[PDB]
């Protein structure tokens, strides 16, 4: 565990991250897709073999001795608001499980379903509050990566109101 369990946000790449494992906002399929996913596969494509996972699910495969945890939130293209909500939700209970799991004292995370996979809608609240509910009992430092400027801001506030 980390000495004092902490939530933080960073700008940036998240295949540049300074944690001990990853968190990739995957599609189902393993494919390399697009966006957090797309830099992920160019910097860890070894996790990539029998990463295959369905919605709402968490796979780790290593890259090294570095964890690479597919989570696979929905596409609110297809998925209702409800069994949407449900689905990511899940995803990130299953993070946080294997998060624990692997006994690691840092994470990188994306906010799952925020880009493609977000039907046209701002879901940042959405994410973070589910993000939030599954890591609150888990006691690796969280680091949150984002690249919009706004939702850096936005995300900063929602931590430190916290406390
Ligand atoms: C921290 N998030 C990201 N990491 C890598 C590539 C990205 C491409 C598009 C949007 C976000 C990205
Ligand atoms: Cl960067
Ligand atoms: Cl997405
Ligand atoms: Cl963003």
Known sequence: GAMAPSYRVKRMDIAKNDEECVVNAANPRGL???GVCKA???KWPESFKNSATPVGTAKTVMCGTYPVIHA???NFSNYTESE???ELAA???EVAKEVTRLGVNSVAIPLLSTGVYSGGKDRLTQSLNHL???MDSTDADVVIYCRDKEWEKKISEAIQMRT
């Open 132 to 134: 939030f509910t599954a």
């Open 84 to 86: 949407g909500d449900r």
């Open 40 to 42: 992920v596969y160019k």
């Open 32 to 34: 390399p897709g697009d």
């Open 91 to 93: 995803a990130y209970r």
């Open 72 to 74: 696979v939130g929905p």
